[model samples]
Target: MLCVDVNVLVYAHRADLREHADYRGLLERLANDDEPLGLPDSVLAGFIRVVTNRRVFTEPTSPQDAWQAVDALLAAPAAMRLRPGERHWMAFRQLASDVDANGNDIADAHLAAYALENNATWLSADRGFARFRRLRWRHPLD
Candidate 1:
């Protein structure tokens, strides 16, 4: 399965972001790729919260637009939620402890664990995810 992070989603929607054009193009392609998608609720929530927040952008996306973007993705045939399984706790705990993840990093650790559990590769631009092992990840921009 293919995974994605909030940063990638944010950049796709927000024209002000550095990689807006490139990320948006990639996201569009993924929608029609016909591959399994692992999209956690948290990632969707993060995308909504950040994109709709005026403080996070000079010109934030409308709440309706944000929700619509999320809706389009979730409505895709290959898109599915990635939730924890029985051993998800072990992987999450270890990943978090290994990197001493706290604050914002707590979320990153959780996503990494999801990818690990599902045997998926994360499509993110954040290098912080590099701390994880036994998990596949790649930055679309790089």
Candidate 2:
């Protein structure tokens, strides 16, 4: 299975980044192809949370529209919602065990655990994920 993370979605939502076009292009392929895909709620909720804020640009994606956008993505054939398995907590707790003193590492650990449970390859731009020993992860454009 191919799993995606919020960094990919956040980049895809904003056309301004250098990585934007490539990220969005891959999303089309991921959503349309018959290949199994993974999109955990953490990623989805993160996408909406980051993009809807007007802090960056007053022209945010319209919190309302972003919700509908997620709805449409869920409607696509290749996409399916991902939830943690029962043992997910143990796996995830280990990931979050030794990370940031601040707050950034929690989501990375959580998503990494999700992919680990599903035996899915995680797609993310952040290099922090590279430290997760068994995670099959790579950048989407690569």
Candidate 3:
């Protein structure tokens, strides 16, 4: 299983990203995977918050559209919510000390913890996560 990060979803959603080629391919590959895709609830919440934020969107997506997007993804046969657990709390506390975390970064930590907890690989485009894992936070993404 692999966790999809907010940036990956955002890039996938933005049509301009297709010009980059590789990212578009990456997103398509992940979305087409046969195995379950691990989704941390925190990640979904962060995605909703960031995508709907007035600063981020020229015009916010209607709440209905947001709900529908989330609902469809969650209902997918390959979707799995990564439940919060002891490791998540511990990782949160640990993450707090290393760097100042925004909603997305914090959500990334939870996703990483979910990966560690489930022994799953964390698929992310955020380099910050790679840096964090270098400090030995048990990031599965290498």
Candidate 4:
């Protein structure tokens, strides 16, 4: 299984982005594949938060539209919602402390810890995710 991050989700939905088609295609491929696709709650929330923010887009997506996009992903056969497990705090603390993750990067550490716990590759476009040692993270488009 592979865990998707918010940036890829945002790029998939925002046509203005140059990587829109590529990210959308990747999502489609994952949905069609038999392997499970992981979508953390944090990532889902981030997707909604960014897509609907006027500061992020000239014409921000409406809440209804943003929800529908997320609904579509949730409906995918291979998609699975991921959440923190019992040992999540230990892993998250270690990752954040090791990387000195603060502010927004702490969120990245949470995703990294989720991926580590699940033994899944964390798919993201953000290079900052690379700082979390032992995380199986990669830029899907790269």
Candidate 5:
């Protein structure tokens, strides 16, 4: 399985972004493919928050549009909504401590820990995920 990150969703929603096409294409392919795809709540929430913020986009996305994007992904046959399991905190703590994570990096640690716990490769454009040695992450669009 491949775990998606927030930035991909954000880029995909913002047509003004340079990477918009790449991100959108990736998501479209995943939605149509048979392979399992993971979408963490953290990523989804972040995407919704970022994309709807006028400060982040010249024309912020509407709540309906944001929700539709999520609905579309969830409707995919192989799409999995990833959530923290029973031992999630334990793994998150360890990963965060190992990387000395702080602020926004803590969020990345959570995603990395999720990837590690599920044995899934994290799909992200952010190189900061590289700091967490436990995760198998790649910038697919790079």
Candidate 6:
């Protein structure tokens, strides 16, 4: 299983000409892979919100379109939704507190927890994730 992050999702859906091809290609490669692609619940929620947001997109995707996209992604034979147990919340809370003080990127802590729980690679473009020595993030193309 591999946890995907928001930037990758954004890049994949980007309207720009130059980067779209590479981003789309990466998305295709990952989507077709045999290993399960894990979608964390929080990340999924965030994706939906961003893609459907009118402010972010000149013509935002409709909620139905967003739902369809999510459904398609989740329908992938190798896709898995990461569900954390209550115990994981303890770690998440601590991680949140630890990061709140330094202003270091904290959302990846959730991704890290999901990855650790599932023993999955994290597919992300968030450079902040690089600061965490224990968590491994792979570029979408890599």
Per-model CA lDDT versus the true structure:
0.83, 0.82, 0.64, 0.88, 0.85, 0.71
Q: Which residue pairs show collisions in model 6?
A: none
What TM-score number comes out for model 3?
A: 0.71
Model 2 weakest 10-residue run by lDDT: 98-107
Candidate that scores best on TM-score = 4
The better candidate by TM-score, 3 or 6, is 6
In model 6, the Cα lDDT at residue 4 comes to 85
lDDT of 4 by residue, 1-142 (tens): 9888888899899999999999999999987789899888888999999999989999999999999999999999999988889977888898899988889888778878888888888898887788887788888876
Candidate topping lDDT: 4
Q: Residue by residue across 1-142, what tens digits does model 1's lDDT show? A: 7888988889888877778899888887776687887787888888999998888877878989999999998887878866778877888888889888889788788878888888888888887787886668898676
Using lDDT as the yardstick, the better of models 1 and 5 is 5
At residue 134, candidate 6 shows an lDDT of 55
Writing each residue's lDDT as its tens digit, candidate 5 over 1-142 gives: 8888888888877888999999999988876778788888888888899988989878889989999998888998878888888877888898899988999888778877777788888889888788888888889685
Model 2 TM-score relative to the real fold: 0.89
Give the lDDT of residue 65 in candidate 1.
95
Kindly report which residue stretches of model 2 are placed more than 4 angstroms away from their true locations once superposed.
97-102
Estimate the overall C-alpha local distance difference test score of candidate 3: 0.64
RMSD of 6: 2.4
Tens digits of lDDT, candidate 6, 1-142: 6778866666676665356778777766777888777888777788889988889878887889877878887887767777786656765655555556244355668666677566677777666666555566777677
TM-score for each model: 0.89, 0.89, 0.71, 0.94, 0.93, 0.82
* Model 3: worst 10 consecutive residues (lDDT sum): 133-142
Residue-pair clash count for candidate 5:
0
Ranking by lDDT: 4, 5, 1, 2, 6, 3
RMSD of each: 1.7, 1.9, 4.2, 1.2, 1.3, 2.4
Which portions of model 1 miss their true places by more than 4 Å? none
Of candidate 5, the 10-residue stretch with the lowest lDDT total is 27-36
